[PDB]
Ligand binder design. Structure first.
Ligand SMILES: NC(=O)c1ccc[n+]([C@@H]2O[C@H](COP(=O)([O-])OP(=O)(O)OC[C@H]3O[C@@H](n4cnc5c(N)ncnc54)[C@H](O)[C@@H]3O)[C@@H](O)[C@H]2O)c1
Ligand SMILES: NC(=O)c1ccc[n+]([C@@H]2O[C@H](COP(=O)([O-])OP(=O)(O)OC[C@H]3O[C@@H](n4cnc5c(N)ncnc54)[C@H](O)[C@@H]3O)[C@@H](O)[C@H]2O)c1
Ligand SMILES: NC(=O)c1ccc[n+]([C@@H]2O[C@H](COP(=O)([O-])OP(=O)(O)OC[C@H]3O[C@@H](n4cnc5c(N)ncnc54)[C@H](O)[C@@H]3O)[C@@H](O)[C@H]2O)c1
Ligand SMILES: NC(=O)c1ccc[n+]([C@@H]2O[C@H](COP(=O)([O-])OP(=O)(O)OC[C@H]3O[C@@H](n4cnc5c(N)ncnc54)[C@H](O)[C@@H]3O)[C@@H](O)[C@H]2O)c1
Lengths: 267, 267, 267, 267
């Protein structure tokens, strides 16, 4: 296995179409031993993760909760056994209140809503690194999920701002993680049809937003020299595993694009 | 004058070494009629602005205050006369609590502090545009101040994250401002010895931070093919005026670098 | 005038729809004294430039000719009067053999053809700077024309490669020009309907190429928050003049986008 | 092995300190079957490659020779057996005449010299893809070696221009390779002490150039959050293998940085 022998924490599973679900599956398929973290709906998450090809302890983590973060490393050591450390950490967490996205005008998102989304989507990447670096091995790897924010786009609005912040946060985390011999990188994925995304295409955030996202997705597949399949999260999961492995040992504070190559093409 | 006939709002004056002070002076020298906004220390700001070559009404604006923002456009119309509109807006506002900068570890900044700094330094750019676009003329120009955050740097820490967010916010504001025939751009300046900056070089934020900033400044002048004078804000002020003029009419959602060309050179 | 008192060399006029024609007109309108250079069809170019609002000496310059380059500075001093120096230089020159563009497959362009196009389109920017820097004043400005090559696009093929090279060349020229107190920058323009461009939309380079360029142009106007008018070179000409003026005195080795803001937006 | 079962062509071995030598070794260690190409000194190259952990046919390829390129695919099919196709191609080829580098002024490089270097260093990436795509399997991978040219640097001069061109060429090759289900990417490596590099540090290209390169190398290790060891090409070789594997299946037309993370940090 690509990840034979590695212990890896994976956050952000909420359904079987979560990107993190597929990351965890591929990791296990490749020999990794996992510990999982979940937010709020733990009974639901345990039931969902029963389907992973191997068993994995599930810990609760609300990244807005300072007590969960304070105790996190202790709980992970319990789950993996004293004297053992993590080789990998996957941050697959994101959220923006509805007022910060969709047909709600960009200017009408209240700061308290934006702030919550930046807290969960960007700041928390630093939070998790802080909690977990003290229990990671040299040669370890932290990975977060990015959506390319270098240009503005319809509908995504404040979530795109949050991703811009996350990319900057990642460059600082690399500085800190480096002292532990640990790498920190983001994977910028193409659009993937998770439950939330389908809901949005379905009009959950307004009809104009839905039309624009659908148009965004189609342009993506068209631009990608190898195509893009929004229904298949597997190529994204493999890329995260590549970064978790020993095969990109000199890459840190960086962004790997798993997007079909769409971002390298104009038309 | 470059700005003959234009009405321009300029925020962010707090001392005579403020970048906004120099922006206002050059603007007046070039024919602009100004309205100013100031935060908290209004008696002090009025006394400082008495030195500008022309008189200009001073309005109070705390960008964290929804009532100031709600009433802002009304107060500006009063100051410039009903039936008159702004041709320009200068956002020169920034702040990060001390815990988000300097030798205080990156991981130790509490979210409430980071959030305040992102509110003032990034979100407020959207806030001001929202308040002011309804009273701007076609062909108008909004300009904000940026410090190039595309790479991590010592000491600047969470302020750099805030600037990453601001750059993303600027691209969205351009989308909105475009409907009014208005441009939105940032100026990325080299480091300038304002009062705060000198204090930091002096060790106000820890000795290690001060040493790194001083080293940052020296490397800048060295890399800049035309040099960089941290004691002279004038070349920055001129660049902002260039963007306020009619001479960059097809540039928007963009960043103009006034940094001596330092960012284009590695060594 | 924005350029009152400045002496400026402007290359690249071949017809009245040339971008350089419009650059020269706006410059003269703003007080500049011009010297022009033309390639090959000098009788035609003189007849075209008779229409400029002021008279200007026309010198012959084939940038592939080492003797023209060797003698250039001497001929310019003759035209503007001994003891006088240039304040500005405009490089508006570009060419790629047909085999390097359009429906001719990317892989089928012979190196000799690509090389000719890189010579004229990229190397020559360094050539002109070398010839002219010895006769420029401190505070001077060199400007070249760019088409944003950071992403691949249909049809433009090897010309896009040439522009990638030009951007890199510009960063080096800034290093050299800096010793003379001279700036060097590119303007990245949106697509403009010159004679060549219309011919291409008309199918001169194959029907598939024409269809793609037309589609490129439409997407541009759509993405640009302030729109893009491919039939109007004026906003581009003004931007070049902005860079020729004293109003961007700390910008060098850089790229200014005059493209309606299209490159800052994804959809 | 990471590359179990894959057939891979590797160019650019000239000594045992060549980056391509280390790429080939790691590939073989990971299960790949190799075919090698060499330029000019074939007796020397065969003797050097005898040290690889497995045997591999050596073919002659001068990328400036149209007959070598025309016959290349035929010769590779012979070496790997009719009915067999390549899964991978490594372009590790670069050259710039001495006049285009070092203390020789940037402006003094003659175009014929620059052109030769762009031919070998940039155009040839397209040349090799053209020759080899007809004999590659779906899911295949082409990889080239890059040195980050996004900013100008002392000494590297026209070689940096060549790399700028190569990055642009790579984005076009991805467009073509995509039709075959093949990816195309570059690896941007930190500086590595090959024979040529040591010679340059030793003053082979002038003392000023040597001093600047040495200073470049030191700054690199300092900026890299995980450090950079210029004497160890292994982390670069692993990264190339990562791209040759099935573990980055949605990345194309892109650049992966194997540079210690140096390019993500300012100071
Ligand atoms: N779906 C896409 O098209 C797309 C594309 C690129 C990147 N991404 C990113 O990938 C990541 C995963 O998203 P997804 O598409 O798998 O969506 P998802 O809804 O399946 O998962 C998002 C996860 O974030 C968790 N979360 C929300 N608030 C939390 C908090 N307070 N504490 C802990 N966890 C919290 C949710 O429980 C959920 O598990 C996100 O960062 C997203 O921005 C998504
Ligand atoms: N000084 C530098 O080296 C440097 C470099 C590049 C960019 N910048 C940016 O330029 C801008 C101006 O900074 P400066 O260097 O002139 O510093 P400064 O201290 O002189 O001005 C900052 C201004 O922000 C104002 N401010 C703070 N909180 C506010 C709030 N709640 N509401 C309204 N105003 C508020 C302050 O009153 C002050 O006037 C900032 O955005 C800064 O980040 C500074
Ligand atoms: N038209 C567009 O959509 C567009 C967009 C962005 C940038 N540009 C760039 O603007 C510049 C001007 O192009 P244009 O659109 O005005 O086209 P144009 O055909 O009007 O002008 C190109 C000029 O280059 C000159 N030239 C060709 N070979 C030469 C040589 N050997 N020596 C001296 N001059 C030579 C021609 O005489 C002509 O005057 C070019 O660099 C072009 O790439 C064009
Ligand atoms: N050494 C570094 O610090 C560094 C850093 C980043 C990228 N790179 C790149 O890595 C690649 C390999 O370089 P290296 O450092 O291993 O140097 P090297 O000298 O060991 O290898 C360069 C190879 O290019 C070959 N070559 C030259 N002309 C050729 C031609 N006409 N046809 C076929 N082959 C030809 C040479 O035979 C040699 O094998 C180059 O592209 C280089 O630019 C090098």
């Amino acid at each position: 296995g690509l990840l034979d022998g590695k212990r890896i924490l994976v956050s952000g599973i909420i359904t079987d179409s979560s990107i993190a679900f597929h990351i965890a599956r591929v990791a296990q398929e490749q020999g990794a031993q996992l510990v999982l973290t979940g937010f709020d709906r733990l009974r639901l998450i345990q039931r969902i993760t029963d389907r992973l090809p191997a068993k994995a302890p599930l810990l609760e983590l609300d990244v807005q909760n300072e007590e969960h973060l304070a105790s996190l490393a202790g709980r992970v050591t319990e789950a993996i056994g004293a004297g053992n450390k993590l080789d990998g950490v996957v941050h697959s967490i994101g959220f923006m209140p509805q007022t910060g996205m969709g047909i709600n005008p960009f200017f009408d998102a209240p700061y308290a809503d934006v702030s919550k989304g930046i807290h969960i989507s960007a700041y928390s990447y630093a939070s998790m690194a802080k909690a977990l670096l003290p229990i990671m091995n040299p040669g370890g790897s932290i990975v977060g999920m990015d959506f390319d924010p270098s240009r503005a786009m319809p509908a995504y609005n404040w979530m795109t701002v949050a991703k811009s912040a996350l990319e900057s946060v990642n460059r600082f985390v690399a500085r800190e993680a480096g002292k532990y011999g640990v790498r920190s990188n983001l994977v910028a994925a193409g659009p993937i049809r998770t439950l939330a995304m389908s809901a949005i295409v379905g009009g959950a955030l307004g009809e104009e937003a839905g039309a624009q996202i659908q148009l965004l997705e189609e342009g993506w597949d068209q631009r990608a020299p190898i195509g893009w399949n929004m229904k298949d999260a597997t190529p994204v999961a493999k890329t995260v595993c590549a970064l978790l492995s020993d095969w990109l040992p000199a890459t840190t504070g960086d962004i790997i694009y798993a997007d079909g190559g769409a971002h390298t093409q104009l038309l």
